[PDB]
From a paper:
PV, an enterovirus within the Picornaviridae family, is a positive-sense single-stranded RNA virus with a 7500 nucleotides genome enclosed within a non-enveloped icosahedral protein capsid of ~30 nm diameter. PV particles display two distinct antigenic structures, the native D antigen (D Ag) associated with mature infectious virus and the non-native C antigen (C Ag), characteristic of non-infectious particles. Virus-like particles (VLPs) that lack a viral genome represent a safer potential vaccine, although they require particle stabilization. Using our previously established genetic techniques to stabilize the structural capsid proteins, we demonstrate production of poliovirus VLPs of all three serotypes, from four different recombinant expression systems.
The rsVLPs were found in the D Ag conformation in all serotypes and expression systems, except for PV1-SC6b produced via MVA in mammalian cells. Only a C Ag particle could be reconstructed from PV1-SC6b expressed via MVA and few D Ag particles were observed in the data. In contrast, the same rsVLPs from yeast assembled significant numbers of D particles (1320 picked particles were D and 2428 were C antigenic form, a ratio of 1:1.8). The C Ag particles for PV1-SC6b (yeast and MVA) exhibited distinctive holes at their 2-fold symmetry axes compared with the D Ag particle of the same rsVLP from yeast, in line with observations of the expanded state induced in PV virions. In the case of the expanded C Ag structures observed for PV1-SC6b produced in yeast and mammalian cells, the VP1 pocket was in a collapsed state compared to that of D Ag particles; filled by sidechain residues Ile-157, Tyr-159 and Phe-237 of VP1 and consequently empty of any observable cryoEM density indicating bound lipid.
Residue numbers in the entry:
A (entry chain C), B (entry chain C): 61 to 232
C (entry chain B), D (entry chain B): 84 to 95, 98 to 112, 122 to 203, 212 to 228, 243 to 335
E (entry chain A), F (entry chain A): 69 to 214, 233 to 280
The structure:
Amino acid sequence: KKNTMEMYRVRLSDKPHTDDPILCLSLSPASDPRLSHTMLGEILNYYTHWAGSLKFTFMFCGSMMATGKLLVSYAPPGADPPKKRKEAMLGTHVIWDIGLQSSCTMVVPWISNTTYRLTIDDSFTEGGYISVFYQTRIVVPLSTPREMDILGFVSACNDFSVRLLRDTTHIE
Amino acid sequence: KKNTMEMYRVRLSDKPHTDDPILCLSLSPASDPRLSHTMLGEILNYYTHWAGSLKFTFMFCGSMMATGKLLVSYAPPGADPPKKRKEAMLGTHVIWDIGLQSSCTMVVPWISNTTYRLTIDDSFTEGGYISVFYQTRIVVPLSTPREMDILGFVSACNDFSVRLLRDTTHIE
Amino acid sequence: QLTLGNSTITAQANSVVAYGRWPEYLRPTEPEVAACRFYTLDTVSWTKESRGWWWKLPDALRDMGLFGQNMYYHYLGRSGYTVHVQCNASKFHQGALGVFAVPEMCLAGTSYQNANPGEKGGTFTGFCPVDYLLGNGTLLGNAFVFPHQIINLRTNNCATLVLPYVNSLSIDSMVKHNNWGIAILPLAPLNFASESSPEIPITLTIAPMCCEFNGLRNI
Amino acid sequence: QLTLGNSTITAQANSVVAYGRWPEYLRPTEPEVAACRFYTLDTVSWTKESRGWWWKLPDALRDMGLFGQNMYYHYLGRSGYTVHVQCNASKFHQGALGVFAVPEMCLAGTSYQNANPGEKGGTFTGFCPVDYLLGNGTLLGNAFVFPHQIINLRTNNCATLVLPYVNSLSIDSMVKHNNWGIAILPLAPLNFASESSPEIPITLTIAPMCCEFNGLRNI
Amino acid sequence: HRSRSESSIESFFARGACVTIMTVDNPASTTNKDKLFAVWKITYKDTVQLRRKLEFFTYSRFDMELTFVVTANFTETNNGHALNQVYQIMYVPPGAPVPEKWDDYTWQTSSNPSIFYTYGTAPARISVPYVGISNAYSHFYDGFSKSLNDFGILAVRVVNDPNPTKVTSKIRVYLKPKHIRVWCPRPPRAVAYY
Amino acid sequence: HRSRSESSIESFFARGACVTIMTVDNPASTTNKDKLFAVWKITYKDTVQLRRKLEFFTYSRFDMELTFVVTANFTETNNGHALNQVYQIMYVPPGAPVPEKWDDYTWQTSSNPSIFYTYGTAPARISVPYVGISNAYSHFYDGFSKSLNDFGILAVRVVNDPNPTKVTSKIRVYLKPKHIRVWCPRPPRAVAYY
């Protein structure tokens, strides 16, 4: 799927639903391979220190008739990636009723001891996670297709900031 | 005729009049061979950028008895040199009745996308044309000579300007 | 020097407003300078043998750019004119022209290709309309009832006719009906001193006034 | 129902004014209704295999009557736009389009016949610009920097972009330089319930705003 | 309390970086080969870093701040004690004739500014203002003839007369775009495309 | 909005351009030939560019801003390590005696200003004021004796004593007319006439 337009969208099928995340995403931009190309990994790959709050918008590209619920959970830094629906529900979550809403927004807050967290440090791998869980299987009428798509958008918030340009763009 | 005083004047005979311009003149000073020696081609051969409106005065060195009409047409830049009287008449023209006037003045306006058009660029060859057409053959009484003369004068207007001295005057 | 848009003719015999009525807007569109130019038709060389020349309006201006593409791509159209004839001659040429603005000029010696020549105009004869009767079966002497002017080459050399819109219908299709007609006839034949130029040009200059077109035909 | 001259489209997803700047007159001419129509280009049938469609402005409107005959018979020309995409789909169709107004859209996979298709538009590919990189060598994900909109077929089916005149020169020749570029890309492929119509149309509707042309070329 | 005034356009771009290494040499008295005057057309499309940083945007207006670091070396064991080289560094503005010989008039022409540099002193320095016909540089052009903005040329030679030493020299050029404005952001190109 | 303040007289003329290359040399201790003091009469009628630009007008009042670029080279393989040459650059005003020897009194005379230049430092520089009898230079004179305005002379030599090295030198002179006024415009001469 890489190198094509199939990489950007996650398929929400209607079969196993084995109580495991649809998608778990690390909240360390400029270090996460799947989050270091989104114009935050392209600006934080020129800097060394970053300090701000991100913003994840999940859009549901399905039919108006499709109904159900999803669970967007945010494990703060120093925690572990929740691996079951109940644990994610016990944390900081938002229930996203796709039936009556089409996009769910989650603003990851800026929590850290320092005023600026190093962008690419392999020691700090507990920067927090954002995960999506099947609260309820999807219900669709008639022959409406089972397979659906969900898209993610990652943006900086109005209080973002970076420091100490690096400019590691070599060629050889 | 070159290298002499015969170059500066154009003869308006009274024979073929084959609906083709008496004289067609490109409006790109400092690049046109017949317009790059008139003290505008001598000042714009020291500069690189020019931006202004020119001014062409055509004087008719004939007898008071000679009567007729001429047609001074201005094809704006991006057009093509009009090659018949009707097409020139459909454009931006002035009818010059030599009988009751002896000099016709035409101020080519400054039209261009940029604020300054390069002086000598061989890519831009559609800078506009000014042409003279026989609106009506010349009528003279008695044995008045058929051959006559017309002189042209090219001057800058009060809003002319140049930029970026070049000074290409070599010797070797 | 006139001020109508792109075209300007140097004109120094005063205007003869036909029927005492100035062309006025119907009480549509307003072309402003789109068609109200001075369309200087081609010149015709008056000689010692020429018998006349007849143009028809608006058929004459059927290829004159914006006016031609507005009268042909509309359905209803009305417009006066300011026909202006100039005969550039020296002091040693003698003659006289009559310019007649013949409304509903039916030159019945009639195919549409013969009675609507266009910019070329035409030529009377002694399609060969008879000059003697003006082509209308009526003696030329009476032709002076038509709103006219005389260009005598010892007092003037230009004649201006301000033709209003004269038609039974307040607005008519310009591609089928020719409201007016300009007939130029030599009243006194041209003559000149020896060795002078033997053919003096005549230039018409039509300036549609208060033109209004209604309808449209795409393209 | 809009009010722009002859053409009116019935439009019930709000307008996304690109860069927060409304198209404004240069501080020329004023075509008014001469070219400020709603030129509804031909529809393109979105299917389960289509990868994208790219149009370029003003090259798209090179045959649209008065605008096409004004941008080609002038020398300088500037104009914003009000591109308007509508994807008529029922409740049982699912998908999502991204409409990107790509300034200086250089789809370098370049002959002038390949980068200026016109009303036909074009088609990305997986002349075959690569959809994955948007044809610009850059990942499609970042493409959202361009002033864009998203047409998700469960919340809306129309998207309006108000493109101002963006060009290094305050006024440029419309026949050589393509200021903008409209790229429509399926973010989520079309899908539908069985036996439903398998190809939903998409109609663009370009409305030149504040157009100004300077110069002229006769004819 | 944070600032955000380090992601500004000028802060992001106003960083000097070598753009070329122009090689010249003082011809030996044997005249084996004439002066190797080095001519280089000012263009940012040879440095990956500056080009990539400039391709985030469509149009830009940046003033250049060229600077020259001059180094030289004898190619032979014998010293020869060549007196300190004097380098002429001529900035041929956009459109002016391009030098084609080490004795062409363009070196002596009045229009082209020039700097004279004695090997050893502080590095030379000029500041080419915003020199362009349009109202902003363009890195992506969607039009056709009938990008490639011309900034000028730099031509460097050794004024000194031939000396039997073969003193080779390599002028490093550092370009720091200052007073830079940028419009119309675009997706960043991958680092493999250059 | 345009300026027009680039076609001004000073902007058109106030451009430095080499006017001569005066050759001197430090005599060898063998005294094969005495010092080649270089004497050059200041005249603009040897540079095509400046002369042509000045022939657009009849009368002019321009102050000179001479500048000297000094270069040198050993003529022999052996270095000899000649200590940095010291050049005396004497501006002989108009009418003063013209030096005829490398030891003439004119070098030591009080009237003639002189500059002492150690090979290596920043280029020398003077500014000859408007030095003329009349109230404006004249490039075209319609009279007869009973043009050729005298600006002065420049005489350059090497103060150092003879050393067995044969250190040849070539002083390039750059003239930038400043505070220049011009009257009575004339047709420009063709570029083949010079």
